[PDB]
Swiss-Prot record:
Record's protein name: Fatty acid amide hydrolase
Swiss-Prot/TrEMBL keywords: Cell membrane, Endoplasmic reticulum, Hydrolase, Lipid degradation, Lipid metabolism, Membrane
GO biological process, one term: lipid catabolic process
Assembly information from the UniProt record: Forms homodimers.
Tissue and organ expression note: Expressed in roots, leaves and flowers. Expressed in seedlings, flowers, roots, siliques, seeds and leaves.
Residue spans crossing the bilayer: none
One GO CC term on file: endoplasmic reticulum
Gene: FAAH
Function statement: Catalyzes the hydrolysis of bioactive endogenous fatty acid amides to their corresponding acids. The hydrolysis of endogenous amidated lipids terminates their participation as lipid mediators in various signaling systems. Converts a wide range of N-acylethanolamines (NAEs) to their corresponding free fatty acids and ethanolamine. Can use oleamide as substrate, but not indole-3-acetamide, 1-naphtalene-acetamide, nicotinic acid amide or L-asparagine. Can use 2-arachidonylglycerol as substrate. Participates in the regulation of plant growth.
Reactions performed catalytically: N-(5Z,8Z,11Z,14Z-eicosatetraenoyl)-ethanolamine + H2O = ethanolamine + (5Z,8Z,11Z,14Z)-eicosatetraenoate; N-(9Z,12Z-octadecadienoyl)-ethanolamine + H2O = ethanolamine + (9Z,12Z)-octadecadienoate; N-hexadecanoylethanolamine + H2O = ethanolamine + hexadecanoate; N-tetradecanoylethanolamine + H2O = tetradecanoate + ethanolamine
A GO molecular function held by the record: fatty acid amide hydrolase activity
Keyword Lipid metabolism: yes
Phenotype for K202A: Loss of activity
InterPro entries, A to Z: Amidase (IPR000120), Amidase_CS (IPR020556), Amidase_dom (IPR023631), AS_sf (IPR036928)
Amino acid sequence: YQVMKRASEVDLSTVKYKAETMKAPHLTGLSFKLFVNLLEAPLIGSLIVDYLKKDNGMTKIFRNTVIPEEPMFRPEFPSQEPEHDVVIVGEDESPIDRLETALKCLPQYDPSRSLHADPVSSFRYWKIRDYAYAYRSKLTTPLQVAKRIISIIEEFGYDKPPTPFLIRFDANEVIKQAEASTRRFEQGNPISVLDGIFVTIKDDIDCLPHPTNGGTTWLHEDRSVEKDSAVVSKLRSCGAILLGKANMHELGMGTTGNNSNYGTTRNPHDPKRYTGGSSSGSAAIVAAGLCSAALGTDGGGAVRIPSALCGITGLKTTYGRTDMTGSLCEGGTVEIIGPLASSLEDAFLVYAAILGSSSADRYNLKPSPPCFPKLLSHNGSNAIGSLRLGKYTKWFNDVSSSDISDKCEDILKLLSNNHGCKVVEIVVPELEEMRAAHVISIGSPTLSSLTPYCEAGKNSKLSYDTRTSFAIFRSFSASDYIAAQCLRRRLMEYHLNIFKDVDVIVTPTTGMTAPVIPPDALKNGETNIQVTTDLMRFVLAANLLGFPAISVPVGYDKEGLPIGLQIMGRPWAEATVLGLAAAVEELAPVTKKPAIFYDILN
């Protein structure tokens, strides 16, 4: 009739791993179209929604389980111990000053990578300091790099359907921004290290002069943009060149990248496969080399998932670390804005430029001052070696393919052998309640902000993928929301006790590599829950609780498809997470060149 739980009075050895996937049929095309009309039906739709909601097990938790906890609406973490061996930069500092101190944490630039490249050598991505050195040594100009990029976009149709990396592009604006950056190098005074660097902005973030649509063809009618977002105003102040708006899953509701409205984005390593949602275009354009780095929103692993499936670095910062003002997901409790880059230097430098809490989140969350990890190996290089890499064996090998399990374990063995890290066995209880508490924690703020527009006769202007969840989200009652916030406090107390014994939690970012796109799904979408289950398996902890996670590319499988590793550290410990991932890519650099690659600067 009812179940009773607790958190403080819970044995650690009494919790066992439950590997039951959310079984749901896969409907594409007309069968998917008729299914959406069945969910929106008056009498039929309401009865069918409760049927699916009771099958997976989300009704037992919400309306048939007594909870002892108090609702934790936002991540509430206590003051943590200081990150050993870092540099504290000012919170109220400017992104120009923070980039200067960020360059002090990087090793000295070796011109042997750019100039005098050996004819027989391995493949490597063009870094940010490679672009900045060629700008200062008059090797190339940002105006020429822009013309070479626009030529690629207008040739392969990367700004055009049905395979668009971008859904909003202005060629005259890109040339105008590269023209202003060019004069700054000709006169001999660049703004910072980011001057002349192209960065793509996701379509759920405001960026002038382009409108913010978020994957729909109607949001610009009801939502207008007049100011740059908090992250764009920081990047534009550093001299960066905002390329355009990247393709994404519609309204950030997805984990594959399917967009039956503007066009689905293909994976650079295999165009017949997905990129990963919801930052689909923001991850492919970086993996293709067309730009240095890009920004994307991480609501439900929307940054780490596509970064792992494409073989690039995706950083999920702590909740409130990066000001979210001027985006579609502002006000949420699980969403952040993190950078996607080809390497870690680019992700570090971009992070140093956009890292800033808002005036509201500063008083509420009380963040510690930001810190940059000393990426210099000398003198000791033991600050990373003295770490407890906590991992859940039952929550590590639950991958659909065994290639990811062996490849990620080699990194743990390499980190333990070359640096002396200890792998401490941990346990993460109540993993089923995390998925149920998360889906309502993110769907409710998204549906509420779109409800006045959907009630305005514009609900039919959404994709069938979004309309599938909007009928599920519209059935979540207010009492179900309060019951989920109490679950967030339970999982907050578990993880905060986990961080007492370990420093980070190392797990694979996803449970599968890049999946092949069904040909029938390119018409109006799909609803394969088994695929989305394997992807959101390891990213929900950083979103529901607000912890800083990363997605460092570790290697490839037997099919040459990228594989990612997740490092989730203490609150406000981006320096600890970025420092460990720096040792990971040194033990496993990116070697394979994607099938869709473009080498600028030549």
